[PDB]
């Protein structure tokens, strides 16, 4: 509901980020692992 | 698009996009136009 979401502070883009990190993985940064760069991914616990 | 909330007031009524602007379908540019014998027509130019 547009009206309900606007009544609170939810901005429909915080929703985008929240869902994209909760129900799917999120690619945030990159780190070195014995000489080669590899991804950092936040995906949320499987129980939720 | 006219029901886009610009600001939400504590009373419950919001200031909508339709309150300050007119929303409708148009064109992304208005540069040129063509007529064939004085009648407005849609035209394309094919360059080799």
């Amino acid at each position: 509901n547009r009206a309900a979401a606007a009544a609170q502070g939810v901005s429909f883009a915080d929703i985008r980020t929240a869902l994209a990190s909760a129900l799917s993985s999120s690619y945030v940064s990159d780190f070195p692992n014995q000489g080669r760069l590899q991804r950092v991914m936040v995906q949320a616990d499987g129980d939720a | 698009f006219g029901n886009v909330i610009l600001r939400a007031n504590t009373d419950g009524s919001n200031i909508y996009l339709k309150d300050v602007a007119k929303v409708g379908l148009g064109m992304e540019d208005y540069s040129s136009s063509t007529r064939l014998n004085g009648v407005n027509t849609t035209g394309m130019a094919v360059m080799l």
Side-chain angles (χ1 to χ4, degrees):
Chain A
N1 296 115
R2 300 305 195 118
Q8 293 94 21
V10 190
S11 295
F12 292 164
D14 299 328
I15 289 163
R16 189 254 304 277
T17 64
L19 285 158
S21 192
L23 281 193
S24 191
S25 179
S26 182
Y27 172 66
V28 286
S29 46
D30 218 348
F31 65 95
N33 204 10
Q34 293 82 17
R36 47 176 71 244
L37 280 154
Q38 276 153 354
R39 303 179 198 284
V40 183
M41 293 177 71
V42 183
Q43 160 66 77
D45 212 15
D47 297 332
Chain B
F1 271 103
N3 282 301
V4 171
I5 294 161
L6 298 175
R7 178 174 61 221
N9 292 342
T10 64
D11 300 331
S13 86
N14 323 293
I15 301 299
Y16 301 104
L17 189 66
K18 65 174 89 166
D19 289 330
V20 292
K22 293 176 206 281
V23 194
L25 276 177
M27 294 182 286
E28 65 186 28
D29 189 358
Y30 290 92
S31 300
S32 51
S33 57
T34 61
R35 306 178 98 102
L36 174 68
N37 289 296
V39 181
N40 275 317
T41 68
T42 293
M44 284 74 74
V46 166
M47 283 73 74
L48 211 67

